[PDB]
Paper text:
One such enzyme is 2-hydroxyacyl-CoA lyase/synthase (HACL/S), which catalyzes the reversible cleavage of 2-hydroxyacyl-CoA (2hcCoA) into formyl-CoA (fCoA) and an aldehyde or ketone. Originally identified in the mammalian α-oxidation pathway of 3-methyl-branched fatty acids, HACL/S has demonstrated remarkable catalytic reversibility, as it is capable of condensing fCoA with various substrates covering a wide range of aldehydes and ketones with different carbon chain lengths. All the enzymes are tetramers, specifically dimers of dimers (α2), where α2 dimer represents a catalytical unit. The three domains have specific functions: the N-terminal domain binds the pyrimidine of ThDP (PYR), the middle domain has a regulatory function (R) and binds ADP, and the C-terminal domain binds the pyrophosphoryl group (PP) of ThDP.
Of particular interest here are the structures of ApbHACL/S with fCoA and D-/L-lCoA. In the structure of ApbHACL/S incubated with fCoA, we trapped a covalent intermediate corresponding to ThDP-hmCoA. This adduct is a product of deprotonated ThDP reacting with fCoA. In these two structures ApbHACACL/S-CoA and ApbHACL/S-fCoA, the distances between C2 of ThDP and C1 of hmCoA are significantly longer than a regular C–C bond (1.54 Å) with 1.8 and 1.9 Å, respectively. Additionally, the C1-O distance in ApbHACL/S-CoA is 1.4 Å which is close to that of a regular hydroxymethyl but 2.0 Å for the same distance in ApbHACL/S-fCoA is much elongated. This suggests that these two intermediates found in these structures represent slightly different reaction states. Similarly, hCoA is partly ordered in the structure of TbHACL/S. Remarkably, in the structure with fCoA there is an intermediate trapped where there is a covalent bond between C2 of ThDP and carbon of hydroxymethyl moiety that is still attached to the sulfur atom of CoA. This seemingly corresponds to the intermediary α−carbanion state with ThDP covalently attached to hmCoA with an elongated C2-C bond distance. Moreover, ApbHACL/S shows the lowest KM (0.41 mM) toward acetaldehyde, which could contribute to successful crystallization with formyl-CoA and acetaldehyde, in addition to lactyl-CoA.
Author numbering:
A (entry chain C), B (entry chain D): -2 to 482, 486 to 554
C (entry chain A): -2 to 481, 485 to 554
Amino acid sequence: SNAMAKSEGKVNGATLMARALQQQGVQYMFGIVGFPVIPIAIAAQREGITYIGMRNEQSASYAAQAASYLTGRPQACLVVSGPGVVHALAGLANAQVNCWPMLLIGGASAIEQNGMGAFQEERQVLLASPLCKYAHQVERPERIPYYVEQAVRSALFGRPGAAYLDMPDDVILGEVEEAAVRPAATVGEPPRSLAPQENIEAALDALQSAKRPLVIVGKGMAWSRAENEVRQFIERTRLPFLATPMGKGVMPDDHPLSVGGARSHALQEADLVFLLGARFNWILHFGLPPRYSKDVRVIQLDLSAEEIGNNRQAEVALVGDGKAIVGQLNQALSSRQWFYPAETPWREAIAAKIAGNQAAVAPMIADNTSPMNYYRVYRDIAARLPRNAIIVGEGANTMDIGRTQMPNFEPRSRLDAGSYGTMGIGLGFAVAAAAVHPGRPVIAVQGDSAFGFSGMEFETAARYGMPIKVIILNNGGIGMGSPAPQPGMPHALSHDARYERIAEAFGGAGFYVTDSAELGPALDAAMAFKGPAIVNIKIAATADRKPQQFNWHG
Amino acid sequence: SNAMAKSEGKVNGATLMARALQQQGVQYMFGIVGFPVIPIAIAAQREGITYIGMRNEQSASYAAQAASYLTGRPQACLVVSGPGVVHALAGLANAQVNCWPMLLIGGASAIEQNGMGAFQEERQVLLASPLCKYAHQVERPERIPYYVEQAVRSALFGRPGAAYLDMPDDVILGEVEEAAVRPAATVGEPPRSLAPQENIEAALDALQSAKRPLVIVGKGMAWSRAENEVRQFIERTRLPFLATPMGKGVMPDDHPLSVGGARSHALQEADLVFLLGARFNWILHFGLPPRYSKDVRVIQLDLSAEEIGNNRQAEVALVGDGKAIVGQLNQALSSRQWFYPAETPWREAIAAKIAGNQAAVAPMIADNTSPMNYYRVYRDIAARLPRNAIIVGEGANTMDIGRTQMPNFEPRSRLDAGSYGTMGIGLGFAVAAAAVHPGRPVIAVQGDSAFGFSGMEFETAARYGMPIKVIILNNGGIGMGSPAPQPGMPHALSHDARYERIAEAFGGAGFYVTDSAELGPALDAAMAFKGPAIVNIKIAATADRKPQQFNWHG
Amino acid sequence: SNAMAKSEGKVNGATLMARALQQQGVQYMFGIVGFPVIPIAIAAQREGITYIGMRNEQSASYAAQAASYLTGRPQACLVVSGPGVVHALAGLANAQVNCWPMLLIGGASAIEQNGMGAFQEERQVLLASPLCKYAHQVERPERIPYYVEQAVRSALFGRPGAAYLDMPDDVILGEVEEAAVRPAATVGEPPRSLAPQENIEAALDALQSAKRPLVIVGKGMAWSRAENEVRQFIERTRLPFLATPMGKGVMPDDHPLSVGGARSHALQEADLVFLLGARFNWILHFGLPPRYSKDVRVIQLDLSAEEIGNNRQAEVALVGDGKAIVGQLNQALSSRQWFYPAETPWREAIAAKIAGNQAAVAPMIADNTSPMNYYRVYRDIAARLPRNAIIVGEGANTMDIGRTQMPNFEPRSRLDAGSYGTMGIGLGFAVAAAAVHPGRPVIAVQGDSAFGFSGMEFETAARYGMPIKVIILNNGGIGMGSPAGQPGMPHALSHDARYERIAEAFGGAGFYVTDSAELGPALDAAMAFKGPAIVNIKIAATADRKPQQFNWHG
Ligand SMILES: CC(C)(COP(=O)(O)OP(=O)(O)OC[C@H]1O[C@@H](n2cnc3c(N)ncnc32)[C@H](O)[C@@H]1OP(=O)(O)O)[C@@H](O)C(=O)NCCC(=O)NCCSC=O
Ligand SMILES: CC(C)(COP(=O)(O)OP(=O)(O)OC[C@H]1O[C@@H](n2cnc3c(N)ncnc32)[C@H](O)[C@@H]1OP(=O)(O)O)[C@@H](O)C(=O)NCCC(=O)NCCSC=O
Ligand SMILES: Cc1ncc(C[n+]2c(CO)sc(CCOP(=O)(O)OP(=O)(O)O)c2C)c(N)n1
Ligand SMILES: Nc1ncnc2c1ncn2[C@@H]1O[C@H](COP(=O)(O)OP(=O)(O)O)[C@@H](O)[C@H]1O
Ligand SMILES: Nc1ncnc2c1ncn2[C@@H]1O[C@H](COP(=O)(O)OP(=O)(O)O)[C@@H](O)[C@H]1O
Ligand SMILES: Nc1ncnc2c1ncn2[C@@H]1O[C@H](COP(=O)(O)OP(=O)(O)O)[C@@H](O)[C@H]1O
Ligand SMILES: [Mg+2]
Ligand SMILES: [Mg+2]
Ligand SMILES: [Mg+2]
């Protein structure tokens, strides 16, 4: 009753944590409650944070980083002591490798029982630390504002990455006087740095000297929110560009300067590559033979000074923020006459290779034979994707062929297995996208193996009214199908699995497709259904991607 | 064709690894293939090792240690580089905490690409090391026999724990001359050590002197295979005994001397406790007030010398193997004639407390009201459990009430959340049990939250023809249900979920139960169905365990 | 004054720690004070603990483990925050590698400043944990008895190793009510375990079947205080034995059964090796060719089950305590007549190899040429070692030649570079020996390179009145000397250095020897000087050890 005297001078750690998270712009918290973190989730809701309770911490820790990428600010994963934290190490590793921020909040057993073999006693900061930019235990409740500020700043500033805060039971429930708690500042936007002017002019001088220049647009530019500057730069210079898998959409994928359909030739024959927030790691084949000229010249824009010149020396280094530096280049271009000319041999070679690759996939796209091939399946899928959708892609062939057949027109609208090649991100990423962008459609296209890692999160989607559209391409195995057996092959799964009945366990709509004639009607119904859906497509066991000169891994 | 000359002088790392695993007694390998470990799973199958391809490495790593516990030998988990290893860290942590052996075999990116940002390059030994007794990279294929011997020996000897072997791609595919490979010795049985004679006699002296003695039978005795010796020891001494959660069955749970129905009174009032392969950690409330007399005398049998006297000093230490040391006690008891007398006040107090607790839960067991309470549901489950079943239990109220309502009569026939309190072990444990003991029934009783962590492994079971019986107690939440919402509560799940439809996705039988009259017939049909099955029981949202003087955690 | 009322109800962390250490048998504490550990050292002295302030924590951490080995109980090293702990990691690593206990107590910056960049803030537990059996922070002063008990037990019990306790400034100075502090039990002697009777009898059966048996006596027997049992065993069986470098003295080095002077032959030709608390690591050349028969049979006695069969399979495993198991063997031998016969080809071969090696070094021992060779120097040094001395040996040729030329007659009386091959242990070990055994002479024979690592601790010895006798064999470099516009060679030091003047800096006696006629008188004067002393011997730059078939490392 409001009539009785109530003591209001004290606040506990759970409440201080919720307030600090909200002050620092955490709007989404993905996790699974239990000892000792129930009060944190409840307190978070009372501050208006959106708590999404999931079915495995592995998926929760993936959702938190996806939500961080999409919002531009660290979002939270909340897990119990012991195995809750160990399950969530999955997401720390993935966020580290992708340079994505996130905040993992792990409960811990009470400090006063350390050494005793307490329930879920664990060396949690020690376990998390090699996967984190920042990891620290909160030893007393009155320092929660200090630590939340420092952790969010460390995750968000510089090269982004994962931050971990350890929350012992006795700190969560510990109480301090309201007026005694020292405030913290609100973490603002990440600082942006610029390049020296001499480097800006040297970059432009290099571009003008090149006979076969190539701009590579990576997901660092998407994280930097540099899409306006990049679009202006490519329109001004008229340089050919190649998008990386999650750099897709920074330039619209239908831009006439994209070399995406001539990727192998463009990398092989360029005499100059301009990396925009993209690494010469495995996704770009290291900047080295056999995928590049041994003498390829490199302009490299990265926020990370230590990344400059990895594997292949950079002729011009542009260390700083992608948006700010491309802004400098656009400003410097306004005093120059040069642009990449409308007709060059390079342009003609690129066009010819695009035409050849188009010719290679044209009969597969047109083939209505059932069981379907991947290109036929994507002909129907691509036709149902609205231009403002968020696309989650996961699998081997399903994901890789999906990457070329599903264009993105706006940045940060594609989430996939990323720089770690992770299976297991799929429905976590979709749940994150639907929480952050409830006004936009969310379509996850998964292989049958991929779907098994996180498919139980469909119940999560249904519970929060998230109308995610899950499309499974089922070839009955990992990368390829398998004849019925003699033991089953290690890569074999269940070609006749009726995964769509999982939707029906949770109030969603399930659709099963074996024949090309069923596929359109199934997708139209799934898109129209007011709720989450699974379309389970039984595809050809031996369907494969377009032949190429080089294996993707090599 | 066998007609053409084939060079047979060379063998590769994958084949050496399969042969060494087979030599060392590894019979089960749970994993998910992909780069770079496909050759290892194929080679393992060629040597006759059973390969179980699962749906998430988290479950595979849990399956591996359950198989090790059941077989008495380290069994393998096989995972890909990068996130395959990070996902499997779950199983390493669980194995460390339960003193269970396992062998995790993690693929790695090729050594010659280290530093370059290779696909799934990761510091895998470093990440695994805090969770392992033994962790090492295999740097050259010709060292494979050496390392597999050493890792298996390290995991199995002494206090058991997890071993990790890192297998780089170029080691897996690297070839050596068969004749050149150094063989390794076959790892035998774990050494057993004995206590000094004076300690054996001091232990019997102390038991003779006690007014209220209590033997506590822990899962170390199950691991030691000490059940014959423990059974002879209790029959000879006639001492009251208490089983720990997975120590159930070492003594038959229906034994007249069990104090399991008077657990709180027995721990509170004992003047002497004899720990048999059981720790004074949280499961036994640390051996300290408020759950024990502050002056409780302790005899402590543990293989780990460092464990002796943790939290509560041991009056008599018995450091060595459970089977061997209880064997010494039985021998020394054939030269004394003491037994604990047939009539004592302690016996009378224990019996009256058991009778009071039976009366306390009898009305709930008998109550046929629907939605049902937990004790009612277990009345039908327990009446249908075969005496040789392997029971997997998982959840909070589901698991803990199932612990009291589901007796075990043989050792090593209960697998549950264990010393780490882990949600997520459920279907991986069930799959391991069906793999190891295909001629025994395997029944997993899970809460609805618990089922969500690993439920996709139902496809794994169906694919290998494992007729696991999954019984879900669904209260719509973690620990308790929740009314309709304002946001849904953090612990709420879906009370109306039709989880049994997941069975129908993979060719199993699904049964849905909301009324007590339905429960009997559904369980009968599920047990009789020649295949895996899910029985989804919608139980009362506020059903709870019997009241107790102390919280289980405190 | 005593007349004033004084509150006495409160005690601080520093005092609680000093009392707990004294309760647990810590008698010696080696360290360097500073923030925040000054109150710990003062409190320690108030409880009667001997505090030895050293000149570098590297040496202090080596002293602590040597004192632990000599006393049989963990002794303490006390260091400041940050670099104090980092400097002491040296000792942690050495203690792990040697299976020696020690307790490192590292001060830490105050918990309330964590995250702020406090003076010497550091992740101290994390840095120490890979080098420790046990490492924990003390988070509250009332837990100090609990943690000190647990750390001492973890260090001392089982296979011994290093323990680390982290002591934050606010825990050291924090106060609690005396009456409120929970006592901890006193850690007693390490538990001893026995082998099964079948293994005892199989060991004696194996020994009787061997044609060329060899018993190897390692420093695990010295740690176990098994010298009486081992001497009885060798006297009873008449088996040839070999001492390891710090196993010397467990058997007296002048025992007629020692194969010390025929080591390479004994290892090469033995058909059966009985390891007594010694590992097949590098010191015993792995139990493998080219140093052993490829079919050598092995009986292995180790406390560590996981060590059994490393590198070479064990035919008979004896897992348990060295004293207890050799006790079992001696007892089983009283029911047998068997002993190794007085005349066998094996004895004849051993004796001829011994005579051959004595003849090889006899002229070097007798050669009075100056500058002297190593064997000539040790002729005079060995003549002047009292039977009860503690010998510290450190260097390459100085240490290795000293090992064969300086016999020990009592166990635990030789301290040397050990299983890690460490330069830097010299004067810390000497200071530890002089603190623990002030009634025994302490003689450190060091190479000129070795001396430079720890030579400043001579001021520590002088300050505490420790009459350590430091003898430096100076060849002007690392392993060998060198001639004097080219740079100095990397191994070269100062052949004409006058190291003995360092004794004179600190009130000790310095002697300089270049001529063989000077050596006897200098050693006699140094031994008689009632204080610490340095005898600096300028030896031949090219003096070397006796030629051998095999390099010591290989
Ligand atoms: C490493 C990669 C960036 C390498 O890129 P590629 O696959 O070689 O190129 P993609 O951009 O996908 O294009 C594929 C080929 O199709 C051509 N292409 C692309 N778009 C088109 C269109 N629109 N029309 C016609 N042809 C096209 C393109 O030129 C390539 O051919 P060519 O020019 O002839 O080469 C990528 O494969 C990748 O990100 N893979 C993810 C791997 C992963 O994480 N797997 C999960 C674990 S698997 C291990 O267990
Ligand atoms: C690894 C070792 C145990 C290997 O032993 P060895 O040196 O081969 O044997 P030792 O016992 O020292 O004996 C040496 C040789 O002398 C013979 N020998 C032994 N005693 C005598 C006597 N009294 N008289 C004559 N000859 C003797 C013995 O049979 C050996 O010859 P043969 O029978 O003919 O072989 C040891 O070398 C060692 O511990 N080295 C430490 C290395 C180290 O840490 N250095 C400091 C770091 S170096 C920093 O890069
Ligand atoms: C890896 C991991 N993540 C989370 C937890 C917390 N875990 C609980 C232990 O505070 S147990 C509950 C299941 C209860 O929910 P349930 O299965 O529906 O059973 P029931 O009680 O409702 O009958 C939760 C989720 C955990 N231990 N380990
Ligand atoms: N604001 C920023 N400006 C420029 N570069 C950035 C910024 N934030 C992160 N980066 C960099 O972007 C790069 C992303 O590379 P990568 O993840 O390999 O992209 P992709 O997979 O698209 O090639 C990282 O090297 C990271 O340091
Ligand atoms: N062969 C063995 N003999 C005796 N004790 C063992 C053996 N193997 C393991 N142990 C010990 O068994 C104990 C198991 O304790 P715990 O997991 O706490 O049991 P519970 O959960 O049943 O109480 C561990 O302390 C472990 O060191
Ligand atoms: N009480 C004990 N009884 C038997 N062995 C022990 C005991 N304490 C330690 N040990 C063992 O003694 C061994 C010493 O081996 P090592 O240091 O290689 O000796 P050395 O250098 O003399 O050959 C270690 O393997 C250790 O586990
Ligand atoms: Mg597939
Ligand atoms: Mg529930
Ligand atoms: Mg020298």
